[PDB]
Design a protein around this ligand. Structure first.
Ligand code: UDP
Ligand code: UDP
Lengths: 357, 357
């Protein structure tokens, strides 16, 4: 069973720019995983996208707003000549040249188009339920196409009204791109995500000030004032902005961290930064939020802290020495490998393709 | 050649409520025309719709905003669980039970869905180009499906960037519902449309005040203040609001008018109120706007006046006596009859169905 797959990307930004968030990496690694199994993968993505994984056809159009800026919304908004439209018009054109289409966009349109196609479409939902519109579409589409929508974790599937019908497909990273670090040069803390008020970067800064550890912040700045508000609310904290890096430059510096702090105020579906941290030997200290409670093994690969408890973060940092950095790396080698992930996806696609009609 | 046709309605409101404007009538009369030729017609329309023309399947969902409120827009907005979505999901379901789908909604989605269907879809565009989004979609769809999009008049087709590829299909009214009136009891003026600032009801009121003729206003009030602003800017004018009536109650009172005033500030694609006026023997006095210049035969069935010339309206009213009311009725009997219109549409659909693939 060797298949031809069409991977349809997020319309939020171009692959390799970070503006698309963690999906940019799960899309390319699913590509690597499935090709490792001998499948052809074509990536459809907005103009400016870059990748060395496989064939990428770029599509012109207007970029889409991030669903994280429209939380709880009851309306669907598409810009004129949207890349999302254009990618799915392209998909409609070439659909007969592929065995299955794999959608990564967290958007009303691909879900709506699903039954208008005459090819199996699988959906990767990358985030918890952020709106009644996306929640309602997930319900309608899985009822029409059972087993066609997947999520990272069960905690993610729980955020959806009909999560019980979602497939839990785990995650995978390309472990070859991450170097294990046993002893960082200088003890320090890391924070990896988009700099926005609902990421909780305020709690991490405060933990850094309290423990005297330097904070290195990895991510893209969306609110240039919110980045000054943090530095002006915690002026004794040594905070370094590393910008948005490539996976290679990111793992290089991440591995020099004593631990990664994750401070979600919402329900994090899955922590891509958490898995990458583990790959570098960096233990993970996170609030009990969504998939993270399933990632972090409390007292073995990090610590789970009650939501929004800055005091609890500070206490876990002071326990860091009790975590064997190698346990983190080994947990990531056993689960979250492309091999196992690529296998799950393969037997998933293989069932959809076989039963389509 | 006897066909099964699916008529998809406007999502702006329910048929028979007027909120949908003039399309509510052109849809039902196209139904009557094509059935008169021996074709089956099913109407898909939002919940609350009413009709005695044929089978109407109502569809639940959230109503859509009128494109007239979003002029020049560069975005497409769909409410959660929109009737428009739901009508076109229904259409996708039953499409194989029909020979052709006839869309009346002035909306991005039906145009976008056109090639995702496997049945010929014809489009009735009811208005001039009101946005770059609808203009761009009309271009893309007619290039994919030549001869599948139609408009009222050539003046309407000119508003579109690729109007040269649009079909000009005229219009038809059910003449049996309109009684000719040769001499109204009291001389008076009429105005038929939606009460909004771009309809120019201010110029008609002023014409009424100046000529001492009473103004009867037919339409739905959208801005309850704009209806007081007019009555408080022209307080010597005798203005009567007749509300929104049915075709029977409308023709009954319209026929008692010495003339219908039309004061478009935009480019009116076609004047449904104008044709109905003619049916009642009421001459039409209109600015030189869009299709109206083709409707009104200057000095034979009414008068064309330079855009926004209130003085020119006043002068034409004082010439009313020179118009033979019967010429108006006879122009409407010769053109704008269901028979001729139903014939054009039939030979139109018949060509699309035959050449589809
Ligand atoms: O300087 C950088 C370079 C890359 N990434 C990537 O940003 C993604 C974070 O995804 P996650 O699921 O952990 O949460 P998200 O921020 O997407 O909500 C990860 O793939 C990182 O590799 C980052 O955060 N900062
Ligand atoms: O009290 C009423 C009852 C019905 N109509 C109908 O409103 C439509 C006016 O359409 P037109 O194309 O002339 O311009 P529009 O107002 O739709 O832009 C016509 O079908 C009328 O029959 C009206 O205007 N007032």
């Amino acid at each position: 069973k060797k298949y031809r797959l069409l991977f349809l990307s997020t319309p939020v930004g171009a692959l390799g720019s970070g503006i698309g968030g963690g999906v940019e990496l799960t899309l390319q690694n699913a590509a690597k995983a499935l090709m490792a199994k001998g499948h052809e993968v074509e990536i459809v993505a907005p103009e400016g996208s870059v990748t060395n994984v496989t064939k990428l056809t770029p599509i012109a159009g207007n970029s889409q707003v991030s669903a994280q800026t429209q939380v709880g919304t009851d309306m669907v908004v598409l810009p004129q000549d949207s890349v999302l439209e254009n990618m799915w018009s392209y998909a409609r054109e070439v659909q007969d040249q592929f065995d299955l289409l794999f959608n990564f966009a967290y958007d009303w349109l691909p879900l709506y188009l699903t039954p208008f196609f005459h090819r199996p479409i699988a959906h990767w939902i990358s985030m918890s339920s952020l709106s009644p519109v996306i929640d309602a579409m997930v319900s309608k589409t899985v009822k029409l196409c059972p087993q066609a929508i997947a999520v990272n974790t069960r905690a993610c599937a729980d955020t959806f009204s009909d999560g019980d019908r979602l497939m839990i497909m785990g995650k995978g990273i390309d472990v070859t791109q991450y170097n294990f670090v046993a002893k960082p040069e200088k003890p320090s803390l890391a924070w990896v995500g988009r700099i926005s008020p609902e990421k909780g970067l305020e709690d991490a800064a405060e933990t850094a000030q309290a423990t005297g550890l330097p904070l290195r912040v990895f991510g893209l700045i969306q609110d240039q004032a919110y980045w000054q508000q943090i530095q002006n609310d915690f002026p004794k904290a040594e905070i370094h902005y590393e910008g948005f890096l490539s996976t290679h430059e990111l793992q290089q510096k991440l591995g020099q961290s004593s631990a990664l702090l994750m401070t979600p105020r919402w329900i994090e579906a899955f922590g891509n930064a958490a898995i990458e941290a583990f790959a570098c030997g960096v233990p993970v200290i996170s609030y009990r939020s969504g998939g993270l409670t399933e990632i972090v093994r409390h007292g073995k690969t990090g610590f789970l802290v009650d939501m929004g408890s800055v005091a609890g973060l500070i206490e876990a940092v002071s326990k860091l020495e009790t975590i064997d950095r190698l346990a983190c790396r080994q947990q990531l080698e056993e689960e979250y490998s492309l091999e196992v992930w690529g296998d799950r996806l393969e037997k998933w696609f293989e069932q959809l393709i076989t039963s389509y009609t």
